[PDB]
Design a protein around this ligand. Sequence first.
Ligand code: HEM
Ligand code: HEM
Ligand SMILES: Cc1cc(N)nc(COc2cc(CCN3CCCCC3)cc(F)c2F)c1
Ligand SMILES: Cc1cc(N)nc(COc2cc(CCN3CCCCC3)cc(F)c2F)c1
Ligand SMILES: C[C@H](O)[C@H](O)[C@H]1CNc2nc(N)[nH]c(=O)c2N1
Ligand SMILES: C[C@H](O)[C@H](O)[C@H]1CNc2nc(N)[nH]c(=O)c2N1
Ligand SMILES: [Zn+2]
Lengths: 415, 415
Amino acid sequence: RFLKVKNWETDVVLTDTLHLKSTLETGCTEHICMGSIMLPSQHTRVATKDQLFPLAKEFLDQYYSSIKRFGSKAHMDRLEEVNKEIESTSTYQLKDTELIYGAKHAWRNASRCVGRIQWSKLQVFDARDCTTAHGMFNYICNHVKYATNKGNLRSAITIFPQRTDGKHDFRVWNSQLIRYAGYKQPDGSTLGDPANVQFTEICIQQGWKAPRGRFDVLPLLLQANGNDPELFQIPPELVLEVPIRHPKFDWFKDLGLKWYGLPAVSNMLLEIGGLEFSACPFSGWYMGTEIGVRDYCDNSRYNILEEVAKKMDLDMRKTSSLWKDQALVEINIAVLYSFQSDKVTIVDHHSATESFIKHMENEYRCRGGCPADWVWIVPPMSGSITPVFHQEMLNYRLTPSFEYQPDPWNTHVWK
Amino acid sequence: RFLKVKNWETDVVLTDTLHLKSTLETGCTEHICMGSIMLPSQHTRVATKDQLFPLAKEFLDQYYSSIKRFGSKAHMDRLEEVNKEIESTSTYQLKDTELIYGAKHAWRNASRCVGRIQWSKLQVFDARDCTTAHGMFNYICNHVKYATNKGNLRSAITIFPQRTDGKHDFRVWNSQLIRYAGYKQPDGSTLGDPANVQFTEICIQQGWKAPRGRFDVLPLLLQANGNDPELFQIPPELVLEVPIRHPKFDWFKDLGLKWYGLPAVSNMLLEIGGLEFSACPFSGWYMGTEIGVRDYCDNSRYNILEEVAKKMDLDMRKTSSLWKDQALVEINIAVLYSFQSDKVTIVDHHSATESFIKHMENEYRCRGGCPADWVWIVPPMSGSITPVFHQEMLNYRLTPSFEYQPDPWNTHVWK
Ligand code: HEM
Ligand code: HEM
Ligand SMILES: Cc1cc(N)nc(COc2cc(CCN3CCCCC3)cc(F)c2F)c1
Ligand SMILES: Cc1cc(N)nc(COc2cc(CCN3CCCCC3)cc(F)c2F)c1
Ligand SMILES: C[C@H](O)[C@H](O)[C@H]1CNc2nc(N)[nH]c(=O)c2N1
Ligand SMILES: C[C@H](O)[C@H](O)[C@H]1CNc2nc(N)[nH]c(=O)c2N1
Ligand SMILES: [Zn+2]
């Protein structure tokens, strides 16, 4: 009940008591580990009024514990006040300071996030007075502009009104605010981003006129208070992009690769005090590997290892030549360089992972632990030359949290 | 109770019912996942006679199930025969065919092993008539010669007598049969292999006369029937080694790197039918990354990324140049090439991982599943360009199995 995690590179040992406060479940049992299941049923999100008050009580107690005012008059009165409002309405509303705390601690608790050293530096935009798709668009554009900050990126999140009945739900139908379109061809091959091909079909189903190229920024699909979603185009001056060149290969511009500067996840659920925020897009800055490994070199994403190996003149006959590994390192030297030469914030997988170990140290000290998912923290290349490969990590679910949620087109009662 | 695992690169879905036969525990609960703990307490190994018979019964039933003779006369008589012997002796002895089956299925069940497609092609050497360290040495040398097979390596395992009282235990004190010595210096730096530095001190404590170099093959330390272990030197003609050159860099010989061809783990426990085999060394062939990533480039192993980056003339100033990733891919093109040019069996991390997916397919068909530890299966470089990165895997403990055991010098009642 006082577990220990070791780093088998430095022999550092930390002690985890935080997992005692843990509430939700993991998917594992004593007889089977689910640690490599992508979307476990305990990570996916309808609630009533009986279960609500304990969830509110649990949240309000940790909030007042954090301002060195636990159990005081202001705590007890707010406990009774939310209790009162949950009788009256069978729901309740968070204070501004409560929303900011819950939002930041959802990120803090995100065990698959390697960038959490910044969790306290998060800018919270309260969009809970929004009522239309157009208002959603306005709020999202101000988010994009603010977080982009001319390439000196800044962490932020915009929180739309909380779910209530469940059929009046605010939903961003994009999985990320800025994504490139994906279109299939006659022969079955795919132009653009093969992930978004279904979403691209939906946007044209709603009337998008596609420029049918590679790096075509998708339009937003915004559903407000349960109404059918509407299409909006982020003004291009707000979508910052970095063209990818290499600091050795003058044939790398000829590849003609570029990527948007702002990672901004929009499709997931923010859970605070028992309340569910079905639309809560959040942005930070890219770690190199997310673009140069996953985006560019996944077999079912952009799939460029084929071509980078060609221009490098590599031994592509045999698999054991490691031509794939060799073109993969060049692509990532290139993404990093290209972003860095444009003053656009990016972080390499080595500095990001070192900082996470530093972050883990602080969380075991002033908090008693830090939930972490090794499967997701270790970077997708060069695993064991980074200090997170060698760090034991305890995974557990604390709340406030970010949860996966089903796509709205599989659930939205249409019209 | 009929779980599903998905591959998020090919959309392949397999169905696991095998985990129902699972017995031992994992370390996870419903509220915490231990999936990245290195040596969990459920992976480490003293038993009595009451618990023994169910363990024997469970094993004998699966053995006779596998020869299409389940519950027949030969099964029922052998069930009563082992029952009889467990009354008489409070232990029992495996048939030769039973030892071979249990041994092969321990490997089959090894969830952290990526090379298991070969589990049925395993050569089992019955050493259970051995009584002295010298006999252990003889058996181990014949193992080394056989598995090495002039570089056309062959899987094998040599099984010494089973534990009984627990104080008359057969133990190979080396963690691997062939390992290079590790000696520290005056200034505190380390020559050779920094892992084995404590073992190297023990061997000299027993009287090894060290040549005090880098790649000095360690001598065997063999404990027989609980007696104090004795030193023996594998005849060098039996230790096959591959010097590492690169197929481009004529300065790579100048590095002067070499590695032994035979990976042969000796320190772990084979569990069959309830019986514990405390000495059971097993060998196969190397996957490239185990040498060129972990052995050569771990910070606390050989730590050569420093020097390979120098001769390549790399941007070693800044971390975001990925000079570490770049020297790591060259080292692994080199290990592979060097072994392959000497007809010494090796496998690159790409072909090994593809074959494991193929193996997983067969195990879900003719067995209903396949326990797998994602944390250990994914290779330590280029993770997501290999098909195991994208495969969900269920981990669970089936028996017969290989278990970790404490080092004998922390337990051996000396003299
Ligand atoms: C500030 C810079 C940030 C960096 C460098 C970063 C990096 C990463 C990376 C590499 C992943 C793995 C995802 C993947 O590989 O697809 C991840 C996941 C995640 N991040 Fe962070 N992130 C940042 C900011 C944020 C912010 C602002 C939030 C929320 C407020 C956040 C919450 C999450 C969540 C919820 C996940 C996924 C957890 C899951 O799958 O359940 N991150 N991040
Ligand atoms: C035939 C070629 C083989 C290959 C290519 C191979 C490859 C590997 C690799 C890469 C690992 C991870 C270990 C590490 O990174 O340190 C591993 C682990 C392991 N292998 Fe295999 N191996 C082979 C043969 C065998 C044999 C013959 C046995 C037993 C009869 C075996 C049983 C195991 C076990 C028990 C583990 C570790 C499980 C644990 O940590 O609990 N392997 N193997
Ligand atoms: C703010 C931010 C910064 C950064 N640098 N990176 C990210 C990436 O964060 C996430 C990434 C995903 C990916 C989901 N996954 C992708 C592969 C296939 C299956 C679905 C889901 C999430 F919820 C995330 F927060 C976010
Ligand atoms: C036959 C064989 C072939 C191959 N290609 N490879 C291996 C490596 O197999 C093992 C490797 C280990 C390593 C233990 N670990 C190393 C790092 C630090 C901590 C302890 C433990 C085991 F039991 C193994 F079977 C074995
Ligand atoms: C099968 C496995 O669960 C899946 O591929 C996961 C593995 N770890 C990951 N880690 C990160 N950061 N991102 C991912 O998409 C994944 N995918
Ligand atoms: C902390 C973590 O459990 C540890 O570093 C593990 C991770 N996965 C591994 N995987 C393999 N194949 N070999 C290892 O030594 C390890 N080490
Ligand atoms: Zn688990």
